[PDB]
From Swiss-Prot, chain A:
Family: Belongs to the universal ribosomal protein uS17 family.
Subcellular location: Cytoplasm; Nucleus, Nucleolus
Organism: Oryctolagus cuniculus
Entry superkingdom: Eukaryota
Annotated protein name in UniProt: Small ribosomal subunit protein uS17
One biological process term in Gene Ontology: translation
PTM entry text: Citrullinated by PADI4.
PTM annotation (Phosphoserine): residues: S57, S100
Main location: cytoplasm
UniProtKB/Swiss-Prot annotation, chain C:
Subcellular locations according to the entry: Cytoplasm; Nucleus, Nucleolus
GO cellular component, one term: cytosolic small ribosomal subunit
InterPro entries attached to this UniProt entry: KOW, Rib_uL2_dom2, Ribosomal_eS4, Ribosomal_eS4_C, Ribosomal_eS4_central_region, Ribosomal_eS4_central_sf, Ribosomal_eS4_KOW, Ribosomal_eS4_N
In-chain residues carrying the UniProt-annotated modification N6-acetyllysine: K232
Complex and partners: Component of the small ribosomal subunit. Part of the small subunit (SSU) processome, composed of more than 70 proteins and the RNA chaperone small nucleolar RNA (snoRNA) U3. Identified in a IGF2BP1-dependent mRNP granule complex containing untranslated mRNAs.
UniProt-recorded name of the protein: Small ribosomal subunit protein eS4
Record keyword Isomerase present: no
HAMAP family, per database record: Ribosomal_eS4
Native organism: Oryctolagus cuniculus (Rabbit)
SMART domains with a match to the protein in the record: S4 (SM00363)
Amino acid sequence: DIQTERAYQKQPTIFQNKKRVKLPRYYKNIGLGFKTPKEAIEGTYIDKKCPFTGNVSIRGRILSGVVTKMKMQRTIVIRRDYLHYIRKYNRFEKRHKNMSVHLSPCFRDVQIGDIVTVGECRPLSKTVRFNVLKVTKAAGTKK
Amino acid sequence: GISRDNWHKRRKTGGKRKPYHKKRKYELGRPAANTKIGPRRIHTVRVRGGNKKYRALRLDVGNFSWGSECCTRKTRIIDVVYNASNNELVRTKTLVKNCIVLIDSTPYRQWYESHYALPLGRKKGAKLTPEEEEILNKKRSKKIQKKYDERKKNAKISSLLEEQFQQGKLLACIASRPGQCGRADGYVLEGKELEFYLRKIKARKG
Amino acid sequence: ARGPKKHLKRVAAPKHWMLDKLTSVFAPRPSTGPHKLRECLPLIIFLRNKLKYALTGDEVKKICMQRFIKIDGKVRADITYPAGFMDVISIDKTGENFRLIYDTKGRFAVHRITPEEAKYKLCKVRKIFVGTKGIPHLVTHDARTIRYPDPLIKMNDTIQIDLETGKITDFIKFDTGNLCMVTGGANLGRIGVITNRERHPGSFDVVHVKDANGNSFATRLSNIFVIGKGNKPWISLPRGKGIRLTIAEERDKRLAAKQSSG
RNA sequence: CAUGUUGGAACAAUGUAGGUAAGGGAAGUCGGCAAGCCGGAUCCGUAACUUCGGGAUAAGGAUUGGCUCUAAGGGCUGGCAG
RNA sequence: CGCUACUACCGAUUGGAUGGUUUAGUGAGGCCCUCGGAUCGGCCCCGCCGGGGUGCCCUGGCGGAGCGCUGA
RNA sequence: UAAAGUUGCUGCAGUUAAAAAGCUCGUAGUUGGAUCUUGGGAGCGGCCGUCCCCUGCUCGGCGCCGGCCCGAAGCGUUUACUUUGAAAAAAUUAGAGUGUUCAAAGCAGGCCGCCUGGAUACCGCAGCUAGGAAUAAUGGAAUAGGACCGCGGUUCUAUUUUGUUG
RNA sequence: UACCUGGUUGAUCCUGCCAGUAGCAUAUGCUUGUCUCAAAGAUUAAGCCAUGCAUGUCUAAGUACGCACGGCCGGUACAGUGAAACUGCGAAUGGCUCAUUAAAUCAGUUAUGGUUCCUUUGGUCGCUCGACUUGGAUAACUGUGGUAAUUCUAGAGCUAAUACAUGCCGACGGGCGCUGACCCCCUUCGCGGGGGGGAUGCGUGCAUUUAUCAGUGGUGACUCUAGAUAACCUCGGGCCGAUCGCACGCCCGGCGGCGACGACCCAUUCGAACGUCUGCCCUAUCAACUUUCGAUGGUAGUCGCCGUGCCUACCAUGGUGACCACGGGUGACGGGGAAUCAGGGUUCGAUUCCGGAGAGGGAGCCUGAGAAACGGCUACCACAUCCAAGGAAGGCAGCAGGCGCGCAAAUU
């Protein structure tokens, strides 16, 4: 389950140590018009870099990419295909900036090839400046 | 000096950056406070913008909020017991943010007697014969003893604070930065937090 | 670049002051105030070349430090005071006054008024604060915390406070058809009305601005002021009468003042 | 077992076998001969050349004491407890 | 093959000279912490004397300590 | 730098002048078949040009006798492409504007107090904003986990209410 | 203005190059009547440098007895100027040069809800229930003292303060919270029980700490802003005005009109810094790169103005690349621009505007709001002027002027 880690993972707002006689979970809305899922609020996991149930505010640019790797933890590698116009040779070329993105852990089942939504914020880490805001399931996966 | 520059180290790919300028002042490091538990020894440090920053070097005063009923009294700090950051910061008794430090129960033992009138612990057979607490545990007005009847059924102690208030040792925590502000303020561990930071000590026992 | 600049080159001086390149070699890096370097016409050039009161740095300085220039109820003695939008300037010797409006072109409204018009200012808030014991507070275009506002005044809205005291009288709540003044770019003073409101949460909220001749375009909500209600201004206007004449019609009437005028 | 077929008293030369040497450092000499240095292990790092096997303990560096803890590495009996 | 004229090439020389990055060793100088304590001022009980409430005292020209205590 | 179409995007060349791998296989890369909204309905122009249309309903009016529609609004595969708009230092440059008396400059001055200048386009790409949906992508139902209707059920639980009290 | 001509042949048609042709911008050659704007030690050496100055500065507004001058009405002090001193504020602006630096710098572009900011401006400056104005030294002044001095330097005797420091009246009389003597009413038999006063013991502003409890204004969006409660407070603690100029009444120690400053503080402006997105020359005779000595993440901190492997700790094993990563190179500061130009392009930008970088080479730091500053300092490494041979002093890539360099660039 959870809290097989060193320091007490908690939300720095809610309480859970009062006299009675299922812990109360704090979330928020994000702006732009995005939906926090059932899985965020039904579950009991504890994370701080989420734009919904954590300390980060989404502002500036909001971009999209396609998921390539999920071998890191709480952060994914997405990829941004675009065409670059060279003025001399009136044609294009494939380039990509596979930007480092934090994996907002409210998204339970994300696969590679899923079109993600990413929002600019303050830097979470050295290269990470983005969070996951929505995910679409693979083309089938019937079994 | 010791810098907080982003350019002295490697890129995403691996290739090393080449420095285009020498170190700036704003990219700044000063050594860790390494603040002991002693008498109140605090050096002030000037910081960027012409402001102070209080370096605790020895510090054992600060207030801790008993989270259940929310009472807070400035208490002496006695022992650093746990630190998830480094197991060796416990040894060289250094106060940092999220140090699980011991404080005295006597300012809160005072308050719970001065509000609820219930003596805790004191192994069965032990009365108080000099008698300051027994007339704080008996002999009120006739009808405001019913105020202590409306404060009896829902003032029952926590599962494992019966075995903390008895020994005069509260597992407190530090939620300020004594290397930045020169205080050691925080709260008293309770419930599942108390069943976490005591799980981290008794698992080491056997 | 280890401290603040104290010179500013005249080739690098902003064009909206309409200084040359040859006479001046530097520009006022001003002794500042409630509006920006770009977003002000400073009290030196608003004096020394746009009614041409003063000539040299000797001549300009010998007007300010006497306490003459009656700026919104407290005379201040700085030649480089940034005078932006919806403040009040007054002259106390010549018998002259100003309200700070945008003309439809790059430059501001260089326009004279009476002291009666220089008695109310229309202080649009940029955000609303609440103080240290649940007391409301304000953050305006001129950054003013003159508190106890109207409960129907929100961020996007313009308030009317009295100059003598600093207490609210009227306001303009955000409504479609309020007399508009776009405070941005080349539309920097389109004297029209708000004709539409549609949302850009996170991006920049779209408000379509209709100039009186039915000119349909849009600017972000950031830089759209509202000068009054419907057709009637609460303030006296500059010339042009809010039409934004195109490059074509600058040959039409301006040459027509050479036929019948001489 | 009784110091190797003898003992006692002296502690000169010159020997035989050990050592130690300020500053220099092979100027000694046929010749670095004799002596010296290096030496173990852990941990780095390892060239020319090559029959790709090697060269290789190449070369060249770092640590090593005591005491005191900590973590990791297993049986057994009827994801556990003893 | 043979004269002539430059031009690069290979080549013993454990060739030479240079910039830049770097492990290893000894390590200037600051800064920080830990003591330090040279000095420099205090506070007290009393000694020599005072002026008034009353041999007990509140303010004092002037010497000496337990450095008792305290600070830059 | 132009001439140089002797670096070739526009715009070269490879039978013999310099040049096609000896030959196929092959991965990225590059380029990839046709195919999915059609014509008439409704007024005018001087038989036919143009216009107007054939997407979904919590707030509000020319209103109105549980209710008929229309405007503000949260919300309608995505991408490229294209148009507009936002913003985008001057200087230089092109030049509206104006006689440095010429020229390059310059926001000068002009009429016997007043009037007027100090704009504008461009600013590859990239970002933003609102249309268009041709062109090329790229999807949606296949042991249907199917779009669309109101049901049988199973929980958290808005508030309109059980005279005030529980 | 969208262009061609000569040259291999005995003559030919061609591929093809060399050569003309025209600008352009460095030198150089010879020649130089008028006047106008006007480049200039960029290229080689960011090589070396002989005096000086450009950063300090004096007013009706901390502050003033220099006898330094000089006015008269003096004993209610301080007339009115002007010098060091310093509370404080400037030397971080400029000017110069292009060495490093290849997603750097930089450009457009949005971000700070990640922060800092004297000046400048909004402001708040009896909210707390517990002084008629104070400390005891210091500065300049001043005398005596040496040491070649160099902007080198002790002791004595005086002493001012928006310093160095302590702080009290008033507002003030309560309200705001608990433990509560005590009383007003009683229903049922006494106990069980339902509501208001009231002595009094305590605690109670503004920034920093957690937590409890509902959610009063606000942005697209809070752990914003809050309400309040337990109340918590660095001798190296935030403020709670020990301020000034000139007017000044009613009055015999009280009231008030207009300036002045600085902080706790929030809100600006000038900014700064870290960030987002997209963009750059050559190179495969650079194909893998980076990583229990930080590589790419987590989580707790450490520290920093704040966001971050920025730096530690114990974990996970990532990140990047055939869309050229990484490595090497550049007679690479980038851009705004420049030359040429049918259309496309191509070369150039050290040079006056902007952004960055550096002050021989590196490195460390004081001060200040703001330098990792060199017209500051401290070293080490190189260069180099004094020396009385003990020991001092120094930075022209600021402006002239040397020296060296060169094809190449002015008047101390």
